RNA sequence: CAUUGGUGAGCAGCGAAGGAUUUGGUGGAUUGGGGGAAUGCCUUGUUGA
């Protein structure tokens, strides 16, 4: 539990509860949409669109099967969509700590806008445009 | 009496030299200080202006003394009893002699006169609010004692009254009127008396530096202290256990003194102006290491013994001498910039606090003769430009940090700086020297930039239009200059009739006003290099003037004690105000609300309120020495019977058409014979050349509602005669449509082509 | 232009919380926003008083007995006084604590404020001039209570104060130290929390209401004292009575709910008259007119930003919208209607000259990014984040087409030709630009030319040139209607987001990636780069617009500021928004040359060129009297009255010198006017026309002038463009009146001939 | 050869009987998802007093 709270420089303790509720909604959506006859194109089409939008959200960066929806969607996946982890893994800063130290005091820029929030999220297609000021 | 400006308030006032007094509001304290014919009530701990009195006295305030809520002030023979700055009661001495001092104890009012007579007032009930009932009148014969110094009252002396003379002490029994005690003749004249926290001791400061701890029961000295060359003005007791004493001099120097180890510890040095009389009153509060200082120099300072010397804790003050030049700093009427002749520099607020801040100059600097201000680049570098008397370099100033600039500005011709000016963008510094050179600096990097020289006497004023394109100037040689600022090209100049003493530019209307030596105000256009007006009437020297913010008015003031206002479109003087003291300077606020005057006597800055609610006036001189609503309203998306029959008799349908045009959309009322008189009413409607836009709607709604009874199944009854009466006049009104087709199509063609 | 531009309107009504009340006149609506106070008049909504000393965004508001005094209270406890036209008469920090309610007398003598655990009543100042440092005088104060005072009620005697308290109780106060009936007797027994009390206007029924729906009735028997008369117990209604107001008709009750519905009742009958639903969003407060004819109730900030006006015979008088933070604005070709784009995905039309909320369109699935009119006045194209664009015509209210066709989730910039043939949209996440013929939605081409996200697009009035600014330091120019394509330039600097076109096809304005805003022509001669965008309470360049006369541009970023510039270098004027916690996101320029717009997160537009300022155009005062010399030229020389009194500019003169000259004189006047005194009078007629009823009179003027100098305004364009638009809207809005009704008396005479 | 980085001694100039850097306290104004029962609970029916 608090392993996740300490790995990714979470400024709070509430954020693990919130992302736990969102991932719970995704799992119960997966189970309810799972229990249909598998030739019903309702199930195929809606699980397909759920796959494609979860491609775009960067959570399932891995190209996926259906059964990954039970398997990989955790809190830590969406926590790896937080800004300084994108910053570190894009090899700008040196630690996650120092990335959060830079976003606390305004040197980081996504697009044309200043950022000062350590809970802004990035897509799989907005992270091309990250620079400094 | 005035038709533009109204007397609003004075700002910048802290003290005048009258002794302040301390009051108790529950557990905290307040201070009662005099200014003139108006007093102020401050916090004792954090120094906020808590009250200003509502109404000025006829004459100057002499004695001030207070109780739990009741501030008592003195003038000619009247005692003003006020609460919260508002009068409860006016209680007058039955004489004409001037009131000197007041002592208020128990239920009595003790009123000293200048003729050595004292009046005694009483309450009715011991739970009443103030004394108002006469009790008696005592006198001081000069065979019993000299002139009355002051009035005090020592505690637990039932009905005894302490009246000290310049020689001896008279102790009275006011209920009976007796003189129960007289003291023997003292060597030196007494100027200071003060009660003690213990019984029966009263302190006496002599004319020389002698302190006398006198006892009232036995009548003998206990201790005296000699201070060489000191005129004692004030005594008080720090009763926080630390039994000390302060002794005030007339020099502004203050002796903080230890009474049992017998130690000269401290002296405050020109904390109050010896020129203004030095320390007027110094008082300890009861029970805290706090002493309050006020003098004649328009400032209160709190000195507290940090637990051992005291310390400057917090204070409020202003220019001790009356001001020389002011300016408005903001476009929101908040902070004003003020410079005087006692060489200080203060930035005041205008708002309800009356907090203010003296600038940072970091033995004072020479006084300012020419000031200029811009508020375009605040916070980044300096934006205030000041000259000085008999100097050759103009200093700069920051409005943000309240601190002095970092640049000195040279004339480069060995003259005196006679005029300063800034552009609108705040990049440039214009300086005009008394030998006639106009030099131009950067305001950012403090560097020399550019130099012009056309005038051959002292350049008395420079300005620049808001577009930074055309540069105007004026000399003592009657020459007005007109330049390009983008180039160094020499565009055009004018010869006039007199030397020019002042120049104030108005930027959003592109005019300027010049004050000549022939006592006339000339108004000159800036664009076409042309004189447009010349105004006469001030009998003496024009001193200061300013444009109103919307550029319609000019207000000048002069040594004929007149303050006149001059409407530019009519060329005529619209109002003068004839005052009793002649104001040095005047400026409009950038908002259209406030007019600022600075005077010769007194230190404050008087503020005037522009009325700006109305007027239609132009009066003069010398005196005492909808159309969518109905047409959208008709399409519905979701008695009166006397008049039409009286119109059945004659042609009275104008009142009926008035009750049609008045109110009540009558789509149900025209449905409750009579239709013929309705159509004749309508033909009287078209007969006049008005309100056709409602009338056509009446006609068409009539053909919407009753259109079957109009039709009569098979027409040409007497209905159709009234329709025939409507037809030809409706053919008369056919003309207006083709004009609309003409303008619509031709305007469409000039839109296309 | 030099004029004093200042706020005297706002963009849509209620964004924020507060009280609400009418005037005593019944024709003036008092409906604040959080930041300022917007008092409409009920017929033809306009804007009267505009205070701003509010540092905090809540109001408490009431007028005395004729509307000559208005207050407004925010959270801190300072108030501000205005009389009729926002003089800002008095100003007064009143309290270090907040206020719950403010109430006048019907007599204007006493003054009522509820705060803390006390109750303040003040002696009211009359209207005068200023000259009071502290104008308010304390009359009495009353101690005490047990906790907070939440509602307040005044009586007709001006002797009798009924006030509730937070501790489930009510109290009575005699004003003039009378001790009315020698009793200030409490009211108890209430099981639940008290939301209000009322005193009836016949002095015999004392009224209380609780939060549950309970209502308790006490009598004026003071056997001897208070007895209950009618009780209730509600357990199944299961909401909370949020607000309550009582009729001056003294027969009826009004009860507002958190559940989102509107209750009406009778006082001693307890009959259910009507209840009405409007949503689920809670009712904040409700107040009735002084005659019971009109009802108005306000809705809370997080819920509806909507205030309705329902009558007792059940029809809604004023309905409205006014939703949240705004993306985009554009002026219609008639200078009267203004589109808005909201975040929740609607498109609303605002008639901001008159305060109506006219009409809506709702087909968006998410937020709207771009709106712009076509020059025909027929159609307007909306762009979304829906992944498609669509067309709209005005009062046919019908969707023409919805262009899309490549797989896409984001569009960001929409622009059309003046020709109405082709519509282009720029994908924020494709490196390409899309066109569509409006005939079909056929795809002509896909014009591949960029290397970054394309982010701003506009056309020209020459209409052979496409201006294409992408976010890769590269400005591009395109040909669409020839038989080839083109070479596209390179910027020097600083990634651009904001592009703005001159209406000539000859000038292009760009916003560089800092405070420098720069311009260059279509032969890339860079004229000016201009200095930063100040006023922090980082720096940006978001929107920019070229004014219509061709002499000014307006810059707006996201830093509480907006700047004016001319074609040369100079900073003209910087206006700005004061409030406390982006603001600006879009700015465009009116075709009436009277004002322009700035889309803010608050929502605030107007600039309003006025004429109260003394301008001296051509040596005004050599014409020494504006009165007597003009009086000489009303008797003689009517050519010289125009040139004389026209150099003068008292608006209180132009009505009479313009009216008084005779009809036959007019073509002689217009044939002999100078060509330099022409545009200010052509602009004067175009805005004086819309007010009066002198249609024949002004129409023979515009016949004379437009008949006079047609070729001169044909060649000397771009000012009589603005004036000509201003007169053409008057021509069409009168033509569609009198042609309609003159037709409606053109059928009649031959309809008589029928049978 | 690059008045190239570190370091020290002098000179022109600027100022005069004190100058340059650094820091503490103090006052004024501003700032949860998937499964499950015994046991327990909840709901409902019942059995005897």
Swiss-Prot record, chain A:
GO molecular function, one term: rRNA binding
GO terms for cellular component: 90S preribosome; Mpp10 complex; nucleolus; nucleoplasm; small-subunit processome
Keyword field contains NAD: no
Primary location: nucleus
One Gene Ontology biological process: maturation of SSU-rRNA
Domain S4 RNA-binding residue range list: 81-133
Record keywords, A-Z: Nucleus, Ribonucleoprotein, Ribosome biogenesis, RNA-binding, rRNA processing, rRNA-binding
Subcellular location: Nucleus, Nucleolus
Reported function: Required for the early cleavages at sites A0, A1 and A2 during 18S ribosomal pre-RNA processing.
Subunit structure: Component of a heterotrimeric complex containing IMP3, IMP4 and MPP10. Interacts with MPP10. Component of the ribosomal small subunit (SSU) processome composed of at least 40 protein subunits and snoRNA U3.
Family affiliation: Belongs to the universal ribosomal protein uS4 family.
This protein's name: U3 small nucleolar ribonucleoprotein protein IMP3
Species of the source: Saccharomyces cerevisiae (strain ATCC 204508 / S288c)
Gene from which the chain derives: IMP3
Swiss-Prot record, chain B:
Classification via InterPro entries: Quinoprotein_ADH-like_sf (IPR011047), SSU_processome_Utp21 (IPR007319), WD40/YVTN_repeat-like_dom_sf (IPR015943), WD40_repeat_CS (IPR019775), WD40_repeat_dom_sf (IPR036322), WD40_rpt (IPR001680)
GO CC terms: 90S preribosome; nucleolus; nucleoplasm; nucleus; Pwp2p-containing subcomplex of 90S preribosome; small-subunit processome
Pfam families recorded: Beta-prop_WDR36-Utp21_1st (PF25171), Beta-prop_WDR36-Utp21_2nd (PF25168), Utp21 (PF04192)
Coiled coil: none
Keyword annotations from UniProtKB, A to Z: Acetylation, Nucleus, Phosphoprotein, Repeat, Ribonucleoprotein, Ribosome biogenesis, rRNA processing, WD repeat
Keyword Nucleus set for record: yes
GO biological process annotation, one example: rRNA processing
WD repeat residue numbers: 21-52, 62-92, 100-139, 149-182, 189-226, 233-268, 276-317, 324-358, 369-408, 417-451, 459-495, 500-535, 537-578, 580-618
Keyword Signal: no
Record-linked Gene3D superfamilies: YVTN repeat-like/Quinoprotein amine dehydrogenase
Subcellular location: Nucleus, Nucleolus
CDD domains attached to this UniProt entry: WD40 (cd00200)
Principal location class: nucleus
Subunit structure: Interacts with snoRNA U3. Interacts with MPP10. Interacts (via WD repeats) with UTP18. Component of the ribosomal small subunit (SSU) processome composed of at least 40 protein subunits and snoRNA U3.
Record comment regarding domains: The WD repeats are grouped into two tandem seven-bladed beta-propeller regions.
Functional note: Involved in nucleolar processing of pre-18S ribosomal RNA and ribosome assembly.
Note: Present with 2020 molecules/cell in log phase SD medium.
Protein name: U3 small nucleolar RNA-associated protein 21
From Swiss-Prot, chain C:
Xref: SUPFAM superfamilies: Quinoprotein alcohol dehydrogenase-like, WD40 repeat-like
Regions that span the bilayer: none
Chief site of localization: nucleus
Record's keyword annotation contains Nucleus: yes
UniProt WD repeat ranges: 12-52, 53-93, 94-132, 144-183, 189-222, 236-275, 278-318, 321-360, 363-402, 406-448, 449-488, 491-530, 538-575, 582-617
Keyword Phosphoprotein: yes
Molecular function per GO: mRNA binding
Record's subcellular location: Nucleus, Nucleolus
Record's keyword terms, sorted: Nucleus, Phosphoprotein, Repeat, Ribonucleoprotein, Ribosome biogenesis, rRNA processing, WD repeat
UniProt GO BP: endonucleolytic cleavage in 5'-ETS of tricistronic rRNA transcript (SSU-rRNA, 5.8S rRNA, LSU-rRNA); endonucleolytic cleavage in ITS1 to separate SSU-rRNA from 5.8S rRNA and LSU-rRNA from tricistronic rRNA transcript (SSU-rRNA, 5.8S rRNA, LSU-rRNA); endonucleolytic cleavage to generate mature 5'-end of SSU-rRNA from (SSU-rRNA, 5.8S rRNA, LSU-rRNA); establishment of cell polarity; maturation of SSU-rRNA; maturation of SSU-rRNA from tricistronic rRNA transcript (SSU-rRNA, 5.8S rRNA, LSU-rRNA); ribosomal small subunit assembly; septum digestion after cytokinesis
Domain of life assignment: Eukaryota
CDD domains: WD40 (cd00200)
GO cellular component assignments: 90S preribosome; cytoplasm; nucleolus; nucleoplasm; Pwp2p-containing subcomplex of 90S preribosome; small-subunit processome
Protein family: Belongs to the WD repeat PWP2 family.
Known partners and oligomeric status: Interacts with snoRNA U3. Interacts with MPP10. Component of the ribosomal small subunit (SSU) processome composed of at least 40 protein subunits and snoRNA U3.
UniProt function note: Required for bud-site selection and cell separation. Also involved in nucleolar processing of pre-18S ribosomal RNA.
Further comment: Present with 16700 molecules/cell in log phase SD medium.
Xref: PANTHER family: PERIODIC TRYPTOPHAN PROTEIN 2 HOMOLOG (PTHR19858:SF0), WD40 REPEAT PROTEIN (PTHR19858)
Protein name stated in the entry: Periodic tryptophan protein 2
Organism from which the protein derives: Saccharomyces cerevisiae (strain ATCC 204508 / S288c)
Gene: PWP2
């Amino acid at each position: 539990d608090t392993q996740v709270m300490r790995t990714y420089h979470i400024q709070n303790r509430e954020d693990y509860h919130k992302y736990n509720r969102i991932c719970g909604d995704i799992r119960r959506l997966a189970n309810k949409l799972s229990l249909l006859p598998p030739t019903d194109p309702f199930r195929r089409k809606h699980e397909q669109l759920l796959l494609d939008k979860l491609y775009a959200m960067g959570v399932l960066t891995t190209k996926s099967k259906i059964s990954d929806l039970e398997n990989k969607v955790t809190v830590s996946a969406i926590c790896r969509r937080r800004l300084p982890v994108i910053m570190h893994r894009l090899k700008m800063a040196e630690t996650i700590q120092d990335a959060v130290k830079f976003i606390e005091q305004g040197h980081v820029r996504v697009g044309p806008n200043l950022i000062n929030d350590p809970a802004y999220l990035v897509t799989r297609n907005m992270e091309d445009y990250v620079t400094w000021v | 009496n005035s038709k533009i400006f109204s007397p609003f308030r004075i700002i910048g006032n802290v003290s005048n030299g009258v002794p302040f007094a301390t009051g108790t509001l529950g557990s905290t304290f307040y201070i009662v200080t005099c200014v003139g014919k108006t007093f102020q009530i401050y916090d004792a701990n954090t120094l906020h202006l808590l009250f200003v009195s509502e109404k000025e006295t006829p004459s100057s305030i002499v004695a001030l003394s207070a109780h739990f809520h009741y501030v008592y002030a003195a003038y000619e023979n009247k005692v003003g009893i006020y609460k919260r700055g508002i009068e409860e009661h006016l209680l007058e001495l039955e004489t004409d002699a001037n009131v000197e001092h007041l002592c208020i104890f128990g239920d009595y009012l003790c009123a000293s006169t200048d003729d050595n007579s004292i009046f005694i007032y009483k309450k009715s009930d011991p739970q009443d609010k103030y004394p108002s009932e006469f009790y008696t009148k005592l006198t001081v014969t000069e065979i019993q004692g000299g002139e009355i110094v002051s009035l005090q009252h020592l505690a637990t002396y039932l009905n005894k009254l302490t009246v000290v003379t310049k020689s001896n002490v008279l102790l009275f029994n006011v209920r009976t009127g007796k003189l129960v005690f007289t003291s023997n003749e003292f060597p030196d004249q007494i100027t200071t008396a003060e009660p003690a926290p213990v019984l029966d001791i009263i302190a006496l400061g002599t004319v020389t530096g002698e302190v006398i701890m006198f006892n009232m029961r036995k009548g003998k000295r206990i201790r005296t202290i000699k201070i060489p060359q000191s005129r004692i003005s004030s005594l008080s007791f720090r009763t926080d256990g630390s039994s000390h004493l302060s002794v005030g001099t007339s020099s502004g120097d203050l002796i903080f003194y230890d009474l049992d180890r017998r130690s000269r510890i401290h002296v405050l040095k020109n904390i109050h102006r010896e020129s203004y009389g030095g320390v007027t009153q110094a008082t300890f509060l009861n029970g805290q290491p706090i002493i309050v200082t006020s003098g004649g120099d328009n400032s209160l300072k709190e000195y507290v013994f940090d637990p051992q010397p005291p310390r400057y804790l917090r204070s409020r003050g202003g220019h001790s001498q009356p001001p020389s030049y002011i300016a408005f700093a903001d476009s929101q009427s908040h902070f004003m910039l003020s410079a005087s002749k006692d060489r200080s520099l203060w930035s005041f607020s205008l708002r309800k606090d009356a907090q203010s801040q003296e600038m940072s100059q970091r033995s004072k600097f020479p006084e300012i003769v020419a000031l200029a201000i811009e508020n375009a680049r605040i916070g980044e570098w300096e934006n205030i430009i000041t000259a000085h008397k008999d100097e050759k370099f103009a200093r700069t100033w920051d409005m943000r940090n309240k601190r002095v600039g970092r640049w000195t500005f040279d004339t480069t011709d060995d003259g005196f700086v006679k005029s300063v000016a800034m552009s609108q963008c705040g990049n440039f510094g214009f300086i005009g020297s008394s030998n006639g050179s106009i030099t131009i600096y950067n305001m950012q990097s403090g560097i020399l930039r550019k130099k012009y020289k056309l005038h051959k006497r002292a350049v008395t004023g420079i300005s620049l239009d808001g577009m930074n394109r055309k540069m105007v100037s004026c000399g003592l040689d009657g020459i007005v200059g007109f330049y390009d600022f983008n180039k160094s090209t020499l565009l055009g100049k004018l010869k006039l009739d007199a030397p020019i003493t002042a120049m104030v530019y108005h930027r959003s209307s592109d005019l300027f006003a010049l004050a000549l030596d022939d006592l006339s105000i000339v108004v000159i256009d800036a664009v076409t290099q042309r004189v447009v007006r010349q105004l006469w009437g001030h009998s003496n020297r024009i001193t200061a003037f300013d444009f109103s913010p919307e550029g319609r008015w000019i207000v000048s003031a002069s040594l004929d004690s007149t303050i006149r206002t001059w409407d530019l479109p009519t060329g005529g003087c619209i109002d003068g105000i004839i005052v009793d003291n002649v104001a040095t300077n005047v400026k409009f606020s950038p908002n259209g609300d406030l007019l600022a005057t600075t005077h010769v006597t007194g230190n404050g800055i008087c503020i005037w309120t522009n009325r700006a609610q109305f007027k239609t006036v132009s009066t003069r001189t010398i005196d005492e020495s909808q159309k969518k609503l109905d047409a959208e309203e008709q399409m519905n998306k979701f008695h009166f019977t006397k008049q039409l029959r009286e119109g059945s008799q004659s042609k009275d349908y104008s009142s009926l058409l008035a009750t049609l045009i008045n109110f009540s959309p009558a789509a149900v009322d025209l449905e409750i014979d009579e239709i013929v008189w309705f159509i004749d009413a309508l033909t009287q409607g078209l007969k006049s050349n008005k309100n056709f836009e409602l009338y056509e709607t009446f006609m068409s709604l009539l053909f919407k509602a009753h259109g079957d009874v109009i039709h009569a199944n098979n027409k040409n009854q007497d209905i159709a005669s009234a329709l025939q009466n409507w037809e030809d006049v409706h053919k008369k009104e056919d003309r207006l449509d083709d004009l609309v087709k003409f303008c619509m199509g031709v305007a469409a063609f000039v839109t296309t082509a | 232009m030099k004029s004093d531009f200042k706020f005297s309107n706002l963009l849509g009504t209620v964004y924020r919380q507060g009280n609400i009340t009418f005037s005593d006149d019944g024709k003036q609506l008092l409906s604040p926003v959080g930041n300022r106070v917007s008092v409409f008049d009920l017929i033809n909504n306009k804007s009267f008083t505009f205070e701003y000393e509010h540092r905090k965004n809540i109001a408490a508001i009431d007028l005395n007995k004729q509307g000559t005094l208005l207050i407004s209270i925010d959270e801190d406890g300072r108030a501000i006084l205005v009389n009729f036209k926002a003089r800002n008469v008095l100003h007064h920090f009143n309290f270090k604590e907040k206020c719950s309610a403010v109430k006048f007398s019907p007599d204007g003598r006493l003054f009522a404020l509820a705060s803390g655990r006390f109750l303040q009543i003040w002696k009211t100042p009359d209207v005068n001039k200023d000259r009071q440092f502290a104008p308010f005088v304390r009359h009495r104060v009353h101690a005490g209570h047990f906790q907070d005072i939440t509602s307040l009620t005044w009586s007709q005697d001006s002797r009798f104060i009924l006030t509730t308290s937070k501790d489930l109780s009510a109290k009575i106060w005699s004003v003039d130290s009378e001790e009315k009936n020698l009793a200030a007797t409490t009211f108890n027994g209430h099981r639940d929390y008290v939301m209000g009390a009322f005193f009836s206007h016949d002095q015999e029924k004392i009224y209380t209401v609780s939060k549950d729906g309970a209502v308790f009735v006490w009598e004026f028997t003071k056997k001897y004292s208070w007895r209950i008369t009618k009780k209730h117990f509600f357990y199944a209604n299961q909401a909370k009575v949020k607000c309550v107001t009582f009729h001056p008709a003294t027969r009826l009750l009004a009860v507002g709910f958190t559940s989102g519905e509107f209750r009406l009742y009778d006082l001693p009958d307890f009959t259910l008259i009507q209840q009405l639903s409007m949503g689920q969003n809670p009712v904040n407060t409700v107040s009735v007119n002084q005659t019971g004819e009109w009802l108005a109730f306000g809705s809370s900030k997080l819920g509806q930003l909507l205030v309705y006006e329902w009558q007792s015979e059940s029809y809604i008088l004023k309905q409205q919208g006014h939703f949240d933070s705004t993306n985009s604005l554009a002026y219609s070709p008639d200078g009267s209607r203004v589109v808005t784009a909201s975040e929740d995905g609607k498109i609303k039309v605002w008639d901001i000259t008159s305060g109506f909320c006219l009409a809506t369109f709702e087909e968006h699935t998410s937020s709207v990014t771009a709106v712009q009119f076509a020059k025909r006045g027929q159609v307007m194209f909306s762009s979304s984040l829906d992944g498609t664009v669509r067309a709209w015509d005005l009062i046919r209210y019908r969707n023409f087409r919805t262009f899309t066709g490549t797989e896409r989730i984001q569009f960001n910039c929409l622009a059309v030709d003046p020709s109405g043939e082709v519509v282009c949209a720029g994908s924020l996440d494709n490196f390409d630009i899309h066109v569509w013929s409006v005939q079909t939605g056929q795809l002509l081409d896909a014009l591949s030319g960029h290397e970054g996200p394309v982010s701003c697009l506009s056309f020209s009035q020459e209409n052979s040139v496409l201006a294409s600014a992408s976010w890769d330091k590269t400005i591009r120019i395109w040909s669409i209607f020839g038989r080839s394509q083109q070479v596209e330039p390179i910027e020097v600097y600083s990634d651009v987001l904001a592009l703005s076109m001159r209406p000539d096809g000859k000038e292009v304005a760009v916003s560089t990636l800092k405070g420098q805003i720069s311009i260059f022509n279509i032969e890339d001669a860079k004229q000016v780069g201009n200095i930063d965008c100040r006023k922090d309470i980082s720096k940006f360049f978001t929107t920019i617009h070229y004014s219509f006369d061709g002499m000014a541009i307006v810059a707006g970023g996201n830093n509480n500021s907006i700047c004016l510039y001319d074609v040369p270098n100079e900073v003209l004027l910087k206006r700005f928004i004061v409030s406390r916690n982006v603001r600006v996101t879009s700015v465009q320029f009116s075709p009436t040359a009277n004002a322009f717009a700035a889309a803010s997160t608050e929502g605030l537009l107007i600039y309003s060129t006025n004429d109260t300022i003394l301008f001296d155009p051509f040596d005004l005062d050599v014409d020494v009297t504006p009165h007597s010399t003009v009086e000489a030229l009303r008797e003689k020389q009517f050519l010289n009255a125009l040139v004389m009194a026209f150099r003068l500019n008292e608006e209180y003169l132009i009505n009479k010198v313009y009216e008084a000259i005779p009809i036959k004189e007019i073509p002689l006047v217009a044939s002999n006017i100078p060509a330099i005194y022409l545009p200010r009078i052509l602009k004067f007629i175009g805005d004086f026309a819309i007010e009066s009823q002198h249609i024949e009179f002004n129409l023979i003027w515009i016949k004379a002038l437009l008949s006079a100098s047609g070729g001169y305004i044909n060649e000397h364009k771009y000012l009589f463009s603005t004036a000509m638009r201003s007169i053409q809207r008057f021509i069409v809005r009168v033509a569609k009146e009198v042609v309609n009704t003159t037709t409606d008396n053109k059928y009649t005479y031959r309809f008589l001939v029928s049978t």
